[PDB]
Design brief:
The structure is cut from a larger assembly and holds chains A (about 80 residues) and B (about 100 residues). In chain A, about 25% of the residues lie in helices and about 10% in strands. With about 80 residues, chain A is an alpha+beta fold. Chain A has a two-stranded antiparallel sheet with strand order 1-4. Chain B has about 100 residues and is mainly α. In chain B, about 30% of the residues lie in helices and about 0% in strands. Classes of the chains: A alpha+beta (about 80), B mainly alpha (about 100). The PDB classes it as translocase. Keywords: AAA ATPase, peroxisomes, peroxisome biogenesis, peroxisome biogenesis disorders, Zellweger Syndrome, translocase. Structure of the peroxisomal Pex1/Pex6 ATPase complex bound to a substrate in single seam state. Chain A: Peroxisomal ATPase PEX6.
């Protein structure tokens, strides 16, 4: 592992919020996703398994959500 | 020319990569940009590794543009190049005898 690293805090709570995010999902999981009856249920399904909490989770470009099954392709505007 | 035209008409140069874009719309695709189709096409282009385009150029098979006798007859008895021998009679008329 690392012997050392650099860290620096974000001052004055200046944390950006992304405007759009793209997701890539496999056949089975994507179908299970869209088969849900309503938008809120789909959002909750996204929330639960990925532990992504709104206004509290920071995500990045090209982040693999799970190994070999799904990934976030890119984010906009900020990385 | 007529044969290549016929070959073009027969091939019709149509039905190439139909329905390339997949259906991927989602419910939350609102409350923002209304050009989401353009952005989705942009991303589908972007997910590609690189513009390889290493396609086989021989797929066209242009050699098949062969002529037929019916196509041959498309001449339609085109107009003569020489209007009339009467305009040229003297040519040999003077050279019935040996040349000067």
């Amino acid at each position: 592992t690392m012997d050392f690293c650099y860290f620096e805090p974000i001052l004055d709570n200046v944390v950006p919020v992304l405007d759009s995010v793209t997701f890539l999902i496999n056949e089975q999981l994507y179908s299970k996703l869209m088969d849900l009856p309503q938008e809120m249920q789909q959002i909750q399904f996204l929330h639960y398994k990925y532990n992504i909490n709104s206004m509290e989770t920071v995500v990045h470009s090209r982040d693999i959500l799970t190994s070999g099954l799904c990934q976030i392709l890119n984010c906009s505007p900020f990385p | 020319l007529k044969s290549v035209h016929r070959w073009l008409s027969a091939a019709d140069q149509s039905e190439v990569v139909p329905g390339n874009d997949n259906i991927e719309y989602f419910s939350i695709n609102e409350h923002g940009r209304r050009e989401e189709n353009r952005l989705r096409l942009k991303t589908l282009l972007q997910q590609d590794v690189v513009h390889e385009t290493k396609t086989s150029t021989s797929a066209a098979s242009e050699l098949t543009a062969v002529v037929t006798i019916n196509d041959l007859l498309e001449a339609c008895q085109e107009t003569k190049p020489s209007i009339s021998t009467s305009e040229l009679v003297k040519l040999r008329g003077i050279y019935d005898r040996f040349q000067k």
